[PDB]
Amino acid sequence: RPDFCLEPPYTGPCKARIIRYFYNAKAGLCQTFVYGACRAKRNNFKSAEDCMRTCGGA
């Protein structure tokens, strides 16, 4: 699987408050986290199925 999902999420700058999805290498899958709506990384999917299709190699 990719390594950007093994890293923690990144609310990034700004102050948005959306519940996006990221891969918790410690959870083996993804979890919800706070997104900043800007400068998003690869560990920020809009749905749990969007994360799996990407980092669903566990």
PDB file of C-alpha atoms in Angstrom:
ATOM      1  CA  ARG A   1       0.000   0.000   0.000  1.00  0.00           C
ATOM      2  CA  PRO A   2       1.005   3.667  -0.329  1.00  0.00           C
ATOM      3  CA  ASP A   3       2.914   5.436   2.442  1.00  0.00           C
ATOM      4  CA  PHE A   4       0.876   8.677   2.444  1.00  0.00           C
ATOM      5  CA  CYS A   5      -1.879   6.711   4.204  1.00  0.00           C
ATOM      6  CA  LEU A   6       0.578   5.414   6.817  1.00  0.00           C
ATOM      7  CA  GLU A   7       1.227   9.025   7.850  1.00  0.00           C
ATOM      8  CA  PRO A   8      -1.183  10.977  10.044  1.00  0.00           C
ATOM      9  CA  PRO A   9      -3.830  13.303   8.617  1.00  0.00           C
ATOM     10  CA  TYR A  10      -3.098  17.003   7.982  1.00  0.00           C
ATOM     11  CA  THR A  11      -5.785  19.548   8.844  1.00  0.00           C
ATOM     12  CA  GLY A  12      -3.392  21.893   7.020  1.00  0.00           C
ATOM     13  CA  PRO A  13      -3.707  25.669   7.333  1.00  0.00           C
ATOM     14  CA  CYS A  14      -7.044  27.536   7.169  1.00  0.00           C
ATOM     15  CA  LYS A  15      -9.726  26.745   9.777  1.00  0.00           C
ATOM     16  CA  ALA A  16     -12.280  24.639   7.870  1.00  0.00           C
ATOM     17  CA  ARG A  17     -14.030  21.859   9.816  1.00  0.00           C
ATOM     18  CA  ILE A  18     -14.888  18.926   7.530  1.00  0.00           C
ATOM     19  CA  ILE A  19     -14.906  15.245   8.535  1.00  0.00           C
ATOM     20  CA  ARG A  20     -12.734  13.756   5.770  1.00  0.00           C
ATOM     21  CA  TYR A  21     -11.125  10.291   5.871  1.00  0.00           C
ATOM     22  CA  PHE A  22      -7.455   9.329   6.330  1.00  0.00           C
ATOM     23  CA  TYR A  23      -5.576   6.025   6.747  1.00  0.00           C
ATOM     24  CA  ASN A  24      -4.547   5.223  10.342  1.00  0.00           C
ATOM     25  CA  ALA A  25      -1.669   2.767   9.831  1.00  0.00           C
ATOM     26  CA  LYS A  26      -2.301   1.883  13.491  1.00  0.00           C
ATOM     27  CA  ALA A  27      -5.949   1.068  12.679  1.00  0.00           C
ATOM     28  CA  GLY A  28      -5.141  -0.897   9.490  1.00  0.00           C
ATOM     29  CA  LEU A  29      -7.771   1.186   7.666  1.00  0.00           C
ATOM     30  CA  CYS A  30      -9.031   4.791   7.647  1.00  0.00           C
ATOM     31  CA  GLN A  31     -10.668   7.062  10.237  1.00  0.00           C
ATOM     32  CA  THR A  32     -12.320  10.508  10.243  1.00  0.00           C
ATOM     33  CA  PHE A  33     -10.143  13.573  10.899  1.00  0.00           C
ATOM     34  CA  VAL A  34     -10.376  17.386  10.661  1.00  0.00           C
ATOM     35  CA  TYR A  35      -9.625  18.702   7.148  1.00  0.00           C
ATOM     36  CA  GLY A  36      -8.573  22.327   6.446  1.00  0.00           C
ATOM     37  CA  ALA A  37     -10.038  22.407   2.898  1.00  0.00           C
ATOM     38  CA  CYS A  38      -6.638  23.686   1.673  1.00  0.00           C
ATOM     39  CA  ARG A  39      -3.193  22.156   1.003  1.00  0.00           C
ATOM     40  CA  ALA A  40      -4.746  18.690   1.472  1.00  0.00           C
ATOM     41  CA  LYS A  41      -2.406  15.671   1.279  1.00  0.00           C
ATOM     42  CA  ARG A  42      -3.030  12.140  -0.056  1.00  0.00           C
ATOM     43  CA  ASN A  43      -4.297  11.014   3.369  1.00  0.00           C
ATOM     44  CA  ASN A  44      -7.630  12.876   3.113  1.00  0.00           C
ATOM     45  CA  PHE A  45     -10.488  11.051   1.341  1.00  0.00           C
ATOM     46  CA  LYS A  46     -14.135  12.218   1.292  1.00  0.00           C
ATOM     47  CA  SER A  47     -15.448   8.685   1.950  1.00  0.00           C
ATOM     48  CA  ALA A  48     -14.182   5.486   3.593  1.00  0.00           C
ATOM     49  CA  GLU A  49     -14.562   3.796   0.188  1.00  0.00           C
ATOM     50  CA  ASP A  50     -12.346   6.470  -1.396  1.00  0.00           C
ATOM     51  CA  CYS A  51      -9.565   5.614   1.060  1.00  0.00           C
ATOM     52  CA  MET A  52      -9.908   1.845   0.547  1.00  0.00           C
ATOM     53  CA  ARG A  53      -9.836   2.057  -3.269  1.00  0.00           C
ATOM     54  CA  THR A  54      -6.517   3.855  -2.668  1.00  0.00           C
ATOM     55  CA  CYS A  55      -4.899   2.424   0.492  1.00  0.00           C
ATOM     56  CA  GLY A  56      -7.121  -0.678   0.701  1.00  0.00           C
ATOM     57  CA  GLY A  57      -4.069  -2.979   0.589  1.00  0.00           C
ATOM     58  CA  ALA A  58      -4.303  -4.401   4.131  1.00  0.00           C
TER      59      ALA A  58
END
